[PDB]
Structure formats: C-alpha cells, structure tokens
Amino acid sequence: TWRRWHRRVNTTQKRYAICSALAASALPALVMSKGHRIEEVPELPLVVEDKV
Amino acid sequence: APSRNGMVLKPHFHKDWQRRVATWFNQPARKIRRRKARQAKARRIAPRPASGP
Amino acid sequence: GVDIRHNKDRKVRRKEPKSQDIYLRLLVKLYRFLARRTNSTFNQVVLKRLFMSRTNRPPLSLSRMIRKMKLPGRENKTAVVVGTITDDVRVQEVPKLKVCALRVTSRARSRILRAGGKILTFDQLALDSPKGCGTVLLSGPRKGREVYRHFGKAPGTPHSHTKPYVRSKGRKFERARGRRASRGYKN
Amino acid sequence: PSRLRKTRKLRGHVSHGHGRIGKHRKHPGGRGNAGGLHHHRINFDKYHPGYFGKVGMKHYHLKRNQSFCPTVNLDKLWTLVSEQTRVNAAKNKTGAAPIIDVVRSGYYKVLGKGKLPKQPVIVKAKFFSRRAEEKIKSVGGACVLVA
Amino acid sequence: YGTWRKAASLKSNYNLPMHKMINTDLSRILKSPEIQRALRAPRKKIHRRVLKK
Amino acid sequence: SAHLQWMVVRNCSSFLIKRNKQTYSTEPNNLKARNSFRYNGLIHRKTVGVEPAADGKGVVVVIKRRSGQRKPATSYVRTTINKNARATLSSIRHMIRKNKYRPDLRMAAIRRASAILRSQKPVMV
RNA sequence: CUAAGGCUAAAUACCGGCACGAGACCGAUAGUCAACAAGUACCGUAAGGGAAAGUUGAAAAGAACUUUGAAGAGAGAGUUCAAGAGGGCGUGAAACCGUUAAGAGGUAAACGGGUGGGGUCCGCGCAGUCCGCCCGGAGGAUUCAACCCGGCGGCGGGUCCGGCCGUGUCGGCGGCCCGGCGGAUCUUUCCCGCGCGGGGGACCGUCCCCCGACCGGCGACCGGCCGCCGCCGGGCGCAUUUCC
RNA sequence: CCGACCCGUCUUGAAACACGGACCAAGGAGUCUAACACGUGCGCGAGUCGGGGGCUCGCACGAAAGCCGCCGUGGCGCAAUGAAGGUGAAGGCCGGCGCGCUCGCCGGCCGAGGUGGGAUCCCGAGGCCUCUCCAGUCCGCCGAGGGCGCACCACCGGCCCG
RNA sequence: ACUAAUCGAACCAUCUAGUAGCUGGUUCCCUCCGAAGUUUCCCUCAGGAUAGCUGGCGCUCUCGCAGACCCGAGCCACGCA
RNA sequence: AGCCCGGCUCGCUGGCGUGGAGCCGGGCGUGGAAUGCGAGUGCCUAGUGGGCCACUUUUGGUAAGCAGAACUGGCGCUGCG
RNA sequence: CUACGCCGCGACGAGUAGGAGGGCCGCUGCGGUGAGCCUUGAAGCCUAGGGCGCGGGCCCGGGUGGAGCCGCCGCAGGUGC
Ligand SMILES: [Mg+2]
Ligand SMILES: [Mg+2]
Ligand SMILES: [Mg+2]
Ligand SMILES: [Mg+2]
Ligand SMILES: [Mg+2]
Ligand SMILES: [Mg+2]
Ligand SMILES: [Mg+2]
Ligand SMILES: [Mg+2]
Ligand SMILES: [Mg+2]
Ligand SMILES: [Mg+2]
Ligand SMILES: [Mg+2]
Ligand SMILES: [Mg+2]
Ligand SMILES: [Mg+2]
Ligand SMILES: [Mg+2]
Ligand SMILES: [Mg+2]
Ligand SMILES: [Mg+2]
Ligand SMILES: [Mg+2]
Ligand SMILES: [Mg+2]
Ligand SMILES: [Mg+2]
Ligand SMILES: [Mg+2]
Ligand SMILES: [Mg+2]
Ligand SMILES: [Mg+2]
Ligand SMILES: [Mg+2]
Ligand SMILES: [Mg+2]
Ligand SMILES: [Mg+2]
Ligand SMILES: [Mg+2]
Ligand SMILES: [Mg+2]
Ligand SMILES: [Mg+2]
Ligand SMILES: [Mg+2]
Ligand SMILES: [Mg+2]
Ligand SMILES: [Mg+2]
Ligand SMILES: [Mg+2]
Ligand SMILES: [Mg+2]
Numbered sequence A: 001t002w003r004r005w006h007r008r009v010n011t012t013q014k015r016y017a018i019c020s021a022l023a024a025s026a027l028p029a030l031v032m033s034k035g036h037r038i039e040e041v042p043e044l045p046l047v048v049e050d051k052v
Numbered sequence B: 001a002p003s004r005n006g007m008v009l010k011p012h013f014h015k016d017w018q019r020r021v022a023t024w025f026n027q028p029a030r031k032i033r034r035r036k037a038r039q040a041k042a043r044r045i046a047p048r049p050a051s052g053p
Numbered sequence C: 001g002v003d004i005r006h007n008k009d010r011k012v013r014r015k016e017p018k019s020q021d022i023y024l025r026l027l028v029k030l031y032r033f034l035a036r037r038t039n040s041t042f043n044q045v046v047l048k049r050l051f052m053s054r055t056n057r058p059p060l061s062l063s064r065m066i067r068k069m070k071l072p073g074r075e076n077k078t079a080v081v082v083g084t085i086t087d088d089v090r091v092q093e094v095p096k097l098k099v100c101a102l103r104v105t106s107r108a109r110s111r112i113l114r115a116g117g118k119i120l121t122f123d124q125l126a127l128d129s130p131k132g133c134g135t136v137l138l139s140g141p142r143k144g145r146e147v148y149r150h151f152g153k154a155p156g157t158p159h160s161h162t163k164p165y166v167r168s169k170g171r172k173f174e175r176a177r178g179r180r181a182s183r184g185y186k187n
Numbered sequence D: 001p002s003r004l005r006k007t008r009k010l011r012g013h014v015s016h017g018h019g020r021i022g023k024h025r026k027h028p029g030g031r032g033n034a035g036g037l038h039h040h041r042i043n044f045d046k047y048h049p050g051y052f053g054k055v056g057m058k059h060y061h062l063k064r065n066q067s068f069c070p071t072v073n074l075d076k077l078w079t080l081v082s083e084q085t086r087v088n089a090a091k092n093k094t095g096a097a098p099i100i101d102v103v104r105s106g107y108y109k110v111l112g113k114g115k116l117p118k119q120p121v122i123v124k125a126k127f128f129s130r131r132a133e134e135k136i137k138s139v140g141g142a143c144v145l146v147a
Numbered sequence E: 001y002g003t004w005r006k007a008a009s010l011k012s013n014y015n016l017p018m019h020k021m022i023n024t025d026l027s028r029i030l031k032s033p034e035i036q037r038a039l040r041a042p043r044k045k046i047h048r049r050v051l052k053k
Numbered sequence F: 001s002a003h004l005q006w007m008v009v010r011n012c013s014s015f016l017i018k019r020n021k022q023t024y025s026t027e028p029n030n031l032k033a034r035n036s037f038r039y040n041g042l043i044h045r046k047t048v049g050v051e052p053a054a055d056g057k058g059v060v061v062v063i064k065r066r067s068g069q070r071k072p073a074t075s076y077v078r079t080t081i082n083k084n085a086r087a088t089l090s091s092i093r094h095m096i097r098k099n100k101y102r103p104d105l106r107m108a109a110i111r112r113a114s115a116i117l118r119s120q121k122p123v124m125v
Numbered sequence G: 001c002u003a004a005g006g007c008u009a010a011a012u013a014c015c016g017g018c019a020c021g022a023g024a025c026c027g028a029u030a031g032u033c034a035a036c037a038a039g040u041a042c043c044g045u046a047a048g049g050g051a052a053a054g055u056u057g058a059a060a061a062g063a064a065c066u067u068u069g070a071a072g073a074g075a076g077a078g079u080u081c082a083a084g085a086g087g088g089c090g091u092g093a094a095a096c097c098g099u100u101a102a103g104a105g106g107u108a109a110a111c112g113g114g115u116g117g118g119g120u121c122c123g124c125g126c127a128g129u130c131c132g133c134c135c136g137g138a139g140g141a142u143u144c145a146a147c148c149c150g151g152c153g154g155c156g157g158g159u160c161c162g163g164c165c166g167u168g169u170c171g172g173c174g175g176c177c178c179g180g181c182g183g184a185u186c187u188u189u190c191c192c193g194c195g196c197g198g199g200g201g202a203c204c205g206u207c208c209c210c211c212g213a214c215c216g217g218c219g220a221c222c223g224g225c226c227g228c229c230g231c232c233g234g235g236c237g238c239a240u241u242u243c244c
Numbered sequence H: 001c002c003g004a005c006c007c008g009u010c011u012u013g014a015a016a017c018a019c020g021g022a023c024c025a026a027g028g029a030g031u032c033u034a035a036c037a038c039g040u041g042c043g044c045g046a047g048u049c050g051g052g053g054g055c056u057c058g059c060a061c062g063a064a065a066g067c068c069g070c071c072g073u074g075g076c077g078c079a080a081u082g083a084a085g086g087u088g089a090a091g092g093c094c095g096g097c098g099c100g101c102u103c104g105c106c107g108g109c110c111g112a113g114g115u116g117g118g119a120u121c122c123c124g125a126g127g128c129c130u131c132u133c134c135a136g137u138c139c140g141c142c143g144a145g146g147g148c149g150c151a152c153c154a155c156c157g158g159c160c161c162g
Numbered sequence I: 001a002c003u004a005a006u007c008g009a010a011c012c013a014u015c016u017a018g019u020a021g022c023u024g025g026u027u028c029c030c031u032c033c034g035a036a037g038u039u040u041c042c043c044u045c046a047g048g049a050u051a052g053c054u055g056g057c058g059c060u061c062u063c064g065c066a067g068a069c070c071c072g073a074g075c076c077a078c079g080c081a
Numbered sequence J: 001a002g003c004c005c006g007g008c009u010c011g012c013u014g015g016c017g018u019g020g021a022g023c024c025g026g027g028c029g030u031g032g033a034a035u036g037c038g039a040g041u042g043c044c045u046a047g048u049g050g051g052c053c054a055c056u057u058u059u060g061g062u063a064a065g066c067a068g069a070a071c072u073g074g075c076g077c078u079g080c081g
Numbered sequence K: 001c002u003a004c005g006c007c008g009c010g011a012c013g014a015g016u017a018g019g020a021g022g023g024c025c026g027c028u029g030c031g032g033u034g035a036g037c038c039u040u041g042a043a044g045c046c047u048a049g050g051g052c053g054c055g056g057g058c059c060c061g062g063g064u065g066g067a068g069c070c071g072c073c074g075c076a077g078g079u080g081c
Helices: A011-024 A028-034 B027-044 C022-037 C041-051 C062-069 C106-114 C122-128 D041-047 D074-080 D083-091 D130-138 E026-031 E033-037 F002-009 F085-097 F103-120
Strands: C078-086 C098-104 C118-120 C135-138 D071-073 D099-101 D109-111 D122-125 D142-145 F016-019 F022-025 F048-052 F059-064 F076-081
Touching: A028 F002, C022 C041, C022 C122, C022 E026, C022 F002, C041 C078, C041 C135, C062 C078, C062 C106, C062 C135, C078 C106, C078 C122, C098 C106, C098 C122, C106 C118, C118 C122, C122 E026, C122 E033, D071 D074, D074 D099, D074 D109, D074 D130, D109 D122, D109 D130, D130 D142, E026 E033, E026 F002, F048 F085, F048 F103, F059 F085, F059 F103, F076 F085, F085 F103
Parallel strands: C078 C098, C078 C135, C098 C118, D071 D109, D099 D122, D122 D142
Antiparallel strands: F016 F022, F048 F059, F059 F076
C-alpha cells in the first residue's frame, strides 16, 4: 500500500499549466484539434450573460 | 559494498520496520472529521467565540 | 579489412535541445536558419548554446553583467546571455543596459527597466541584429555549482582540497583519522 | 514508469546485465559499511578520511537555541529596509541616518563581508565583527548594541 | 491571474508568466527585410555524384 | 501564431491518423489531406479548401477571410462552382493566383477539384 | 518545583466485530486456503496439515414415437437460431491418437543455400491499360468572350473618416467624503489610553478609469468610403464562340 | 548437389564418455519503500518549498482541484573555521605629513587585483564594383594589423578561521 | 540402542521468505560501441575494495563552411604520435 | 612560453654599477627535421580481477599436452579460405 | 518543406561479458481522441489462402464462434520464456 501513489506539484507550475490551458482554449485551431465541433460558434472565447 | 565516491549512509532499517508503517490514506478523512467537529462545536456554543477563551 | 578504430567515430554533442519547450524549439528553428544562411559565428555559438542543458547554461547575475558591460569599448552594445538573468541585491546602482536573455527574473527585470534599460527576447535580437553585430556575448559562471567542489582528486589524497560527501558537518563527522597527525596521518 | 527502465531491455539476456562469471550474488563483501577497516579500507581512506576515531570534547544535552546566532553581511545589510528608506536617506539634506534593526529582520550578528554605500546608517545588532564595525564607521555610521 | 502589468489581486503573490519569444511568427521574422539583407544566397543546385569515367 | 499552433498540434490532434507507416490529417480545409504545416487547414491565417457540393455535381471552394480569425461562425466564405471542368479549374486558378491568396496551394487545389469532378461524373460501362 | 495519596473529556490507535461506500487491483493454476454442501473431503494417536471443484439453453422446449440389442450403446424421428449447445453440456488450442487424401522411404530423423518436379490455391490472366493536348469525321446543348445589375472576398490608400493600439508628455479638474493597493517614508504639533498607545492625515511607489494633445502604425485589433482585381448569381449575348 | 554434431550452462577449452532437458499448455524471476550521488527536463530564482494545519454545498467524479501569507514555524541554500572558548571573508591609484622608518592620521576617486591563453564582439590601413574617365556623393564583402575580452585553465598576488 | 516406518537429540507450529563469498535459472527485435583475468590492500587464495581496461552524457576549441551553374586568387590550423 | 635590446623592483646574494629572480616596454615570422593525424577537458559508470596458446628470450625439472616469467600477436570474444 | 521534414556527398559495418539508442515491436489497465468497429456478427481459435517488414511482428481472405473490441496522443505496470 505504500507505493507513493501521490505526487506533489509546485504551485507556480500548476498555475502555469492553468494559464496555458486557458490561453489554448481561445485558439480555434487547438479546440478543433481537440475535436469539439466549433464551426458555428460565433466567437471562440464564448461569453454569455449572467442570466445563465 | 562501497562503490567509488559516495556518502557513508546509515539506514535505520534493521529493526523489522514493515510491521510498523503508518500510512496516511485517512488524512483527508481526518481533515473532514476535524472540520465537522469544529463546526458542530461552534454551533453548540452559538454566540461564544468558536476558537475558545 | 581496414586498420582503423571505431571507438571515436560518433561525436557526442547536442544536435538539438533535449527540451520539448515549443517556444525554445521555434527560436532554435530561427537560429538554425540564421546560422546556416549567415557567416556570423555569433549565430553558431548562440545556436549551440540553445542546444545546451540547464547546468551548461548557468544563470548570469546582474552584478556580473554590469561588471562585464562596464569594460572599456562596450558602450551601447547589447549584452546577450543564453540563459537567465538573475537579480543581484549586492549592487546598488544599475546603469542603462540593453540586454537580450532567454529568461529574466521579475525583480531583475524591474530593476533593469527602472534604470531605463531595454530587455529583448532572442527573436527581437534576431530582428535587431541578425548577424549579432554590436553584441557582448556573456555567460554565467559554468563551474559555480556545488558539484564542482566535490569533483577533482579524491579527498583522502595528498594536496587535494575537494569537499567530501558527508551527511552532517561537525567534529564527529570525518575529522579524526586521515585528517590530523594526532590520529594516524593527515596528508 | 517501469517501461523506461533497463529491465525491459534486459529481457532475453540470461545474466540480466550482471555477468556470467561473477554473477549477482546476495552480499559479496558484507552488508552495509562492513569491513571499512579491513577489506574496504582503500575506499574508506580514499573518499572518507577522518572517518575512524574520536576528536574533541563531548558535550551532553546540547541545546541549539543557546548557540542560535544568525549572521548578515554588510553587502546584504541594506536589503533589510525598504528602497524608500535608502533613497530618502541618500537624498536627505540633513545628515539624518536611518536605523537598521537586524534583530528585527532576524539576524543577531553583523559580519563585514563586502562594502557599504557611502552614506551614514545606524545599525542595531547583538554582536558586531571588528571589520563590520570599521566599515560602518568608515561611511560615517554608528554601531549600537542590543540585548 | 493578473495582467502582465498587475499582479493577481486574488492570489497575493502571483503574476502572469513571461514569454521567452515575443513574436512567434517565424514566417514574418524570416521574411523581414532586415533578416533578408544579412543572408547569403541560397545554394539550390543539387550536385549528385559524378560517375568516374 | 501558425508556427506555434503547429508545434502544438503536429503530433497531438484528433484529425491525425498514423497507420501503415503513413500519416494523414482529416481537418476540413486540408488539400492533399496530409499532416504538414503547409497544408494544415486550421493553423493558417488564410486557408483554401475544395469540397464536393451537397448534390453530386460541382465543387465548393471555401476560403478563410482575414478579419474574423477567432470567430469560426463567419470565418469561412464558400462559393459553389458548377461549370465545366476547364471553367472550374480556371475559376480556382484565378481565385488563388490573381488574389495572391496562398499561391503555394494552387496546384493542390486544382488537382483536388479535378479529382472531385472526375469522381462526380457518371461511371462508364 | 513541592515527591513518597486520588480522579478527569477532547484531539490519538484499531489486520477482531456489526453495517456500509469505493477502487488506474485480481479475474477461476489469478484473487483469501475457500467465487462451489471449504477450514469441507481427506491425512495424522495427537498437536496439527488441508485440497480439487464456476459456465447447456432466451426458455427444459432436457429428445415423444418407431427400430436392433439383455443392456451399455446405436439408426431414424423430434425441440431449438444452434445439440457440428444433449445434464461435468459456452468457446474448444497444443502434446498425443484414429481414419481419409497426396507424396516419399537401405546411410536415424531434422536443418541451411540452390534449383527442379508435382499439388492446393490466387490473379474477373486469357487478345491486354490509361489520360493531357491537337487533327479529322459525324451529333447535341446551354450559352463562349465582352458588357449591365446585385452579392461576396483579396489587396492598397496621405488616416482618405472613425475606432483605436504601443511608448513616452503635459495640467492633475480629476481619489483616502467623490476610484484602489502597498511603503522599515514623515506626523496630533486638529482625535478617545500616561509628558507614554490606537486612529485620522501628508508624502512616496505602483495604480485606476478620465478630460485631451504630440510620436510610430493600421499592425497579424477592426469598421465606413474610394481604387484595382477575383469569384458567384441573374440578364443580354443563340453561333467560324463555348461545352458534352 | 553442396554445406551441416544438441541446445542451455560453468569453463582456458563442450558435440562431449560434464550437468539439466520425454512431450505440450498455463504460471515463472532486478520489484516497491527509504537514503544518497550524478546526469537530464520543468518552475521560480538569493531565494525556494506548504509536504503538517486551516478555509472553501463535506462526498458522482471530488480521498480531487482551489486558496492561505502575521499559517514560511521549519527544511535546504545564502559563511567559514577551531576540540573549544571564540573569531569570522575589499582592494587599486593620485597625494600632501611623522621619518610615506617597508609604516601610522585623512582627503579625492573607483569598486574584488594581475600575467598568459581565450569563443564572440569592436576599430581597421588597404582591396572587390558597372561603357571609360579628372570629381565626391550613400551604404555591402574581403582584409594585414590593433582593441575590449565571456566561460574555463595555468600561475602570481589579496582576504577569513586554526 | 529405543523413544509411533523419524534418533549422535522425536514430532508439530512459529520466529522464517533465517543466512549463503556456493550451485541452478533469469522471458521481445534491430542498431552502435565494446572488455578483463593485471597493480596495491584485505584471516584474502571459489570473495571484495582499489587502479587499469569499457560505455554513456557532454563541454571547450581548431580547418573552413564561399561564389545562385561555374570560378584559388616566402605564407598556408590549436595541438597530437 | 623562442631570440635579442633597453628599463624597474627585491627585505635574497654581495668588494663592485655583483649575482639571481621577478616585473615592464620594444624589435624580430625563412613557424627553424621527415611522415601522419583534428585536439583538449569533465562527470557518471558496468563487466572483469580462474585465463590459455604460438615464435623468440628464459627459471625449476630426465621430461611432460609439467610448473613459472619477459616481448608481441592470437584464442577466450572470431566467422571465412 | 510531417523543418522531429526533405535532399546531397564521403567513409565505414566481427563480437562474449557489458553499456547505450531506436522500436508505426508485443501484453494489460487509466485519462483523452477516432460523430472508431460490432448480432448484416466482437473476442478467441483453426487454415496447402494473399501479402508486408532485416526483425520483433502485423494486415487482409475462408471457416468456427456468439458479445464485446481496437487505432492514435499521453499515463501506469504483477508486461514478453
Ligand atoms: Mg568492411
Ligand atoms: Mg567494433
Ligand atoms: Mg550481450
Ligand atoms: Mg534461456
Ligand atoms: Mg586483518
Ligand atoms: Mg483458487
Ligand atoms: Mg479458463
Ligand atoms: Mg457396460
Ligand atoms: Mg453454433
Ligand atoms: Mg463444449
Ligand atoms: Mg491426421
Ligand atoms: Mg553448468
Ligand atoms: Mg575444467
Ligand atoms: Mg554446450
Ligand atoms: Mg569426451
Ligand atoms: Mg556422469
Ligand atoms: Mg554441476
Ligand atoms: Mg536427465
Ligand atoms: Mg522438467
Ligand atoms: Mg507463458
Ligand atoms: Mg488540497
Ligand atoms: Mg524562521
Ligand atoms: Mg583573464
Ligand atoms: Mg593565489
Ligand atoms: Mg529458506
Ligand atoms: Mg564456479
Ligand atoms: Mg571468479
Ligand atoms: Mg605454461
Ligand atoms: Mg570466459
Ligand atoms: Mg578482441
Ligand atoms: Mg578468427
Ligand atoms: Mg556490429
Ligand atoms: Mg512477472
């Protein structure tokens, strides 16, 4: 049971990865390459009103 | 046997350590239980400060 | 059959960065093109430094950069380091410096920009001076590492001052026999 | 990742990288630091001189807190206050000198490595070295002691 | 997460990471006139081996 | 940027097929359908693609407009050419060459249009 | 500090027990010894040792009936999608065996290289490809070019007009009441605690949105106007054009 | 037709009259933890690290992820040396003075010395140009020499502790 | 001699996966490089440490990178064997 | 890193402006044998540490397919004529 | 012109113990992805069937079978006899 199942990652690196993922989520080529079927979405950084 | 340069190491693993190994898989559960106990105590002493005296 | 020896045929050297950093790979593409299509040996040196590892690209302190750029005849030249610029808190006054670097520490960047300096990435350096004209190519201390204190002749040999590997430093840890004439010998 | 290791490449080779002659046996040479004076003496003398024997006075019940005395050098001395402090002191018309409390910053002794900028400063410390005091007096400062 | 001009106000020590390559447009960098003036002419002729008659 | 996005998706993409010592890319605007920086139909600021028409006659030439790069709904302009083969190839040649809209894809687009038209014409006996 | 008297919850432990939940675990030689009438069968005087063993089918619809045999077992018939699923019955490998077919056989077999013969198969093999231009022949058809209208793109434009963008630069009108966050920077010499604190101010650093201007640019942040080009749709063009 | 001894293993030497192997199926042997060392990749960088705790609908995922900042206590690094008491890392030039006595009192500067190598960079006399010339307009290449010299090496000085 | 087919110290379970410098085994492919049975020390001589022989990772430099086809226009590298 | 000119320092040496060493400038390239080759440098490191054979030299032995050394090559690790 | 790509020229190719690299070699499970495959037939197995690769191995045809399985990008092993 003491296999060392868990890894600790530096907080700065975790924040860095979050920033990279967010930056990539606004590029249509990368989201299309993930295969998310964005062909009729009006704007890839898709923002809706707070009513939702 | 020593091999080239190195640090003289003295592991304290000559005493049947595998019978006494404390794993920490219950650490998140322990944190949850402690938080629940804190909240229950704070509710019990309602206007009194939660941390105590 | 031919009377030759094959043990040194394959030269051991970096032909590419071992890193998977895509920005580093893009600017390696840029400097590969520049080193191929120009006669500037500066581009070749910069490319081979880009290939290098982190221990082979030691950080350059602000104080050392200032000292090297302060030398005569280096006015209005671009300091180029393939690596990280590090703030030195031991220096008080920072002059105006135009520096290109792979990374700059946040505090060092703030100090350089507050002193009226300019900071360039390597693509900007390629645009500003494709042949590397008017540049001072600097390097951090390559042997400024703890491992080099242990490297060398063995500690238990005469006239060797190489640091031994000890788990603790104290009067009980490797100081008696072979370290003083009162216990056997010293060398 | 076990898929990146030599074991995945040593499949099919009988000796598993340990040789056919000398083999891989349990403990040839002893266990741990065995024979450091007999048959590993060359290794011990070559890489760990001083390993054997006693040197010095033993002291029972050592308390590290008693000897706790962190040090700061004069080259890092001005980093203990704000940049505003140093610039205001430098551009001050009057000869007023700022006070630096290294005990407040977490240091007990002021050491003398480096040089100071040419401006007076009062330094509060538990201990001073001789050259640190000399260099502080050189820039027109003062060294004052605390307990 | 902050701007590059502002530190993050909800993380108390965090700022956005920096680019080691400001302009990643390799095509425009290579086709820029100041790069092109510094280059030697391309050697675009293939010199295959000559059969030794 | 195109080069940066290429470094991202050159080996990790849902359109990437690696089989039989070959590689192919199935993104919509890829002439020759090959995994390459030049022919990738997503990473470039301007792209051109040729597809069969909804009905089995003619071709649809789609080009990427300049402005709405982050707006995929209006990023592509599609025209339908249902002329004879020579006229269709002339139209595609003029759209690529006269506009100077990616002149390095001209013969790829012409060959793809020829393939589509040949597939569309009725089979023989 | 006050021994040689005493009690005391919480935070802590938990491979037994009761009841649960889950898993980048194992999948019937694995996982508990034990997926099953398993601490069972069985072994030893005893202490104790200790297995093997899952799967028909959706449903028994589990083969009525006839026939040979004393029967086991067969031949028919029947159920089923299937018994080439028939009560240790999902699939059903290898070793090994029977039979059939082909080939061969006195240096034990077996093997590497090279051919040859035979055989089973494969090739829609069996009159042998295609396709770009042009010439000639014999037929069709919108329509070919150029013009007109409309739409949409690409490129360029002193910024033509905005919207702006980067870097500075001014007066701070602009914020501790009517914009923030920080400073080991100075203070009531206006405010509540002994001449001894907490507030409130000033300054500084980053700011913030602003009133505007000058520098570089329309940039890959976009629009409107023009100019050129391209495409498409609809007209006209109906024949030495164009296309099939 | 030619070639062809049975594999594995220990061995100087195996086809061996050396050992294991009748055949087939399934199982079957460098693993995990801890501690070091070096190399490589990543983040930040004279700092770095929340791993223990706490805060967040307590829980499908989530026993995750996020956050703390007067939670950075603490670890490692930033200072060494001595058994210890303890001590603890800045020099070079121009000067006026004792007596510039191989040294004591200050100023003005600058801020880790010097030699030999040293990638790179800088200057560069003179050359390379067109239909030609007397006459200078702008920049490109080659270039003998010279200069500043990264890292690193060898050496000589200097500073700290015994 | 005998002490339940066991006796120069029974049987059972556990410590226990006891230790072994000794024997046996140690599971896919291709490519590249490629040994040693020697020195010194060891209650060492069937074993280790140590140097040597090996591999891997590099790094610091040297000759230049030539004419877009083409075309050199006393003196010809640091250093090594 | 050579040679040759000057000059400076020394608390060493000393009849002597002596000797020696160091330091600072300057001028000398016909690169001061042949041949070949690109060199320098660091870290980590496995296996090995039973060897055997041949020409020649060689010790013990009557001799040995014996025992022990030196040199080079080989077998071990290597197929092929 | 998948720049981790493509192209050119020259030399070279033995290998135990051992070291390293590559593997679009192979097994199992996890995160993604293939608007993947499948009762109009998955896995497994059999095959004088057609092939590919130096090889590890893989693809396709035919049969049997009767319900699940695989490619690619990463991750992790109780991973190859
Ligand atoms: Mg050869
Ligand atoms: Mg070899
Ligand atoms: Mg091997
Ligand atoms: Mg084997
Ligand atoms: Mg002894
Ligand atoms: Mg079982
Ligand atoms: Mg089974
Ligand atoms: Mg019977
Ligand atoms: Mg069936
Ligand atoms: Mg059956
Ligand atoms: Mg048969
Ligand atoms: Mg054996
Ligand atoms: Mg023998
Ligand atoms: Mg054998
Ligand atoms: Mg024999
Ligand atoms: Mg025998
Ligand atoms: Mg034996
Ligand atoms: Mg036998
Ligand atoms: Mg057997
Ligand atoms: Mg098996
Ligand atoms: Mg958490
Ligand atoms: Mg602390
Ligand atoms: Mg130097
Ligand atoms: Mg020295
Ligand atoms: Mg045992
Ligand atoms: Mg043996
Ligand atoms: Mg041995
Ligand atoms: Mg002999
Ligand atoms: Mg051997
Ligand atoms: Mg050999
Ligand atoms: Mg041979
Ligand atoms: Mg080989
Ligand atoms: Mg296994």
